[PDB]
Write a protein that binds this ligand. Sequence first.
Ligand SMILES: [K+]
Ligand SMILES: [K+]
Ligand SMILES: [K+]
Ligand SMILES: [K+]
Ligand SMILES: [K+]
Ligand SMILES: [K+]
Ligand SMILES: [K+]
Ligand SMILES: [K+]
Ligand SMILES: [K+]
Ligand SMILES: [K+]
Ligand SMILES: [K+]
Ligand SMILES: [K+]
Ligand SMILES: [K+]
Ligand SMILES: [K+]
Ligand SMILES: [K+]
Ligand SMILES: [K+]
Ligand SMILES: [K+]
Ligand SMILES: [Mg+2]
Ligand SMILES: [Mg+2]
Ligand SMILES: [Mg+2]
Ligand SMILES: [Mg+2]
Ligand SMILES: [Mg+2]
Ligand SMILES: [Mg+2]
Ligand SMILES: [Mg+2]
Ligand SMILES: [Mg+2]
Ligand SMILES: [Mg+2]
Ligand SMILES: [Mg+2]
Lengths: 116, 204, 116, 50, 182
Amino acid sequence: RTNVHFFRPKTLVHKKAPLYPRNPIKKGSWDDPCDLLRYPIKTDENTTQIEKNNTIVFIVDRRASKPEIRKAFETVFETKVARVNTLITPLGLKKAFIRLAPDVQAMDVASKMGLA
Amino acid sequence: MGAYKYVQELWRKKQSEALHYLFRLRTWEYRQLNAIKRCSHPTRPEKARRLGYKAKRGYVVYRVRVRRGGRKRQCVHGISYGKPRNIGIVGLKPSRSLRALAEQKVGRRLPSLRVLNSYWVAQDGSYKWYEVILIDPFHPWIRNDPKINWICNPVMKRRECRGLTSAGRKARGLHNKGIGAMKLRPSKRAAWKRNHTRSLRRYR
Amino acid sequence: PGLKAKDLVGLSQEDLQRKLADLKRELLSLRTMKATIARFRVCKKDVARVLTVINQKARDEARAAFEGAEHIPKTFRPRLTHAMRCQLTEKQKRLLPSKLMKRKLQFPKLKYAVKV
Amino acid sequence: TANKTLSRKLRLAKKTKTNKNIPRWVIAKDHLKKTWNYKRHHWRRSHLKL
Amino acid sequence: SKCDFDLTPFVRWPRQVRIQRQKAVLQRRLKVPPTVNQFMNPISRNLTNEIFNLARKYSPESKEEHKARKLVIASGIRRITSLVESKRAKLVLIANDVDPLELVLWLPTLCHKMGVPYAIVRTKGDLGKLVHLKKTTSVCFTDVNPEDKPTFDKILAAVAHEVDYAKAMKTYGGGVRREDEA
RNA sequence: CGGCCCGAGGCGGCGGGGGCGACGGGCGGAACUUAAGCAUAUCAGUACGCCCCGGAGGAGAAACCAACCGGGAUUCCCCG
Ligand SMILES: [K+]
Ligand SMILES: [K+]
Ligand SMILES: [K+]
Ligand SMILES: [K+]
Ligand SMILES: [K+]
Ligand SMILES: [K+]
Ligand SMILES: [K+]
Ligand SMILES: [K+]
Ligand SMILES: [K+]
Ligand SMILES: [K+]
Ligand SMILES: [K+]
Ligand SMILES: [K+]
Ligand SMILES: [K+]
Ligand SMILES: [K+]
Ligand SMILES: [K+]
Ligand SMILES: [K+]
Ligand SMILES: [K+]
Ligand SMILES: [Mg+2]
Ligand SMILES: [Mg+2]
Ligand SMILES: [Mg+2]
Ligand SMILES: [Mg+2]
Ligand SMILES: [Mg+2]
Ligand SMILES: [Mg+2]
Ligand SMILES: [Mg+2]
Ligand SMILES: [Mg+2]
Ligand SMILES: [Mg+2]
Ligand SMILES: [Mg+2]
């Protein structure tokens, strides 16, 4: 014997196997495109944002991160995002600054949506 | 006749050489274990049956160790204030016996079981050991058996917390009847409240 | 106005999943118009009519997937209070020992009349 | 403070949002004569403990 | 090769292992009274083996009992004792390691008084295997078929020469010193 | 190498935990106050603190009372 200490013997360990499912029906959550995005914020400061800087400002659900925002906007408006900045306003809402890819016109995308 | 008549006769000779040796080996061992411990089988099978044990699925036995001697009050610096009749600190005696305290300790540790009864197994200068019988009341062997399924009904929860076991009954005075016992039968509080009531009838 | 709950009964899962996709997207359009009116009320509750049905068809399917099992999911178990689940059965409460019973069959219950 | 936890920010954000008058159409709708919302507060004389 | 000598004598064993080893030391050390000491001196191995061979021909049903949806030996302390008390047991076999020892401490005295031979045999677990149970305190022969009395009468003879009740009640046990035992 | 004994880790089904200004059960437990002062006594086996049930709870089929030409488990009401 090499070690002077007594350790617990190695014994088989099983995986779990519940006899009935604890969640028989898979329900939805807060996140899904068209629910994570709420509406755009329309101001003259924010119109300048689109004509130059190619950027659209949106209100989104507070629980969404930057990677969930990029994917949602790409699937709903069929376009290409480049970078997303975010903040939580003094009232509790989440604002996203969404910059489109350098070969897309956010005027063409804000116009089809109604933002103009 | 059977064998348990001899075992009962033997246990009435605790001073004998034989039982003095066996009582010595048990106290050395119990001193090497924890205060509350599960037992595989009863250490005294004949006394266990006298108190209601049955070798079926749903009956369990635990050994409980409690400490010997009197009671000391919880008063900071050993100071009672107030009237001089109330000044004593050391030399007091607990109101419940040590057998009853053993059942209450194991009821608190295992609150999903039902305490049935208890009996003595050993003692030395610092400790006494008791064994407690407990029933699991949701086992099907227990529930479907008319002999024991009185304890599956919910007025039997935490019996030892309410003074309903045999040792708890003795401290309330309930092993007596007649002269000397007329002021305790429902409860000591209940007889006081009945005897001190002003009943103002309509046609007084 | 808007969708009746009865007229989505009989529709397939795909025809209900596909119908929910347009309702979600339409509320994005209508929230965008609000922030940049009678229809927007009816659309919120069209979404609720459909999700009501998608869940009601899924519960009746699963509650037959387990109809004859020993262990059932806890959502599909009877509706009882915590105290009722823990009570003895009336048969269990009426059980008597063997000797006690064989004495109740001897000496039955009898009707009789006494006179003044 | 300029360095606040998100949990304190959210409870402060709600006191700001609900600090409002009764709308005037609500005064016509519900036929009210008390028109002041006495649950309002002002920053100079308040002690929001949030 | 972490260590050049052997470390096994210095292992700190778990609490449960240390207590049962020290318990066995305490019974070599103390002074054991004769009624308790007689369970520390069972029958030899040769005579035990050739009783176990006789006994397994009066062995009850093992695995026909799920297929059932003879002279046999008896088991259990309640039934054995009432047979010694009516002079029907012809041999009692008592186990050596009954954990509550007071269940059988009195039983050799009873067999002596009533005229029944007895034998203390090792491991109650083995007796259980004779009656298809896990363990048992005692077994008893009540009678045998005629081909076996040329052995039963001879086994009683070997029992009589080997089990002596008089010196059983006179001899203490224990009392063994460390340097003495080696 | 198997058996029995005494333990260890994991897996499955089932149960426990918290909540209430009353009534109910078990513990710990005052002082103001009265005594025309104040120590025993009284207030009070109360306030208050901790634990535990139920729709009621507790108690219960004599190791009882009696002293009679006798009653007969427990609880509650009238009476002294
Ligand atoms: K202790
Ligand atoms: K004081
Ligand atoms: K004082
Ligand atoms: K006083
Ligand atoms: K008593
Ligand atoms: K009395
Ligand atoms: K009157
Ligand atoms: K700031
Ligand atoms: K302020
Ligand atoms: K007190
Ligand atoms: K006082
Ligand atoms: K006082
Ligand atoms: K005073
Ligand atoms: K006083
Ligand atoms: K006095
Ligand atoms: K006093
Ligand atoms: K007093
Ligand atoms: Mg949902
Ligand atoms: Mg930021
Ligand atoms: Mg409930
Ligand atoms: Mg488990
Ligand atoms: Mg007062
Ligand atoms: Mg005074
Ligand atoms: Mg005065
Ligand atoms: Mg004074
Ligand atoms: Mg008094
Ligand atoms: Mg009751």
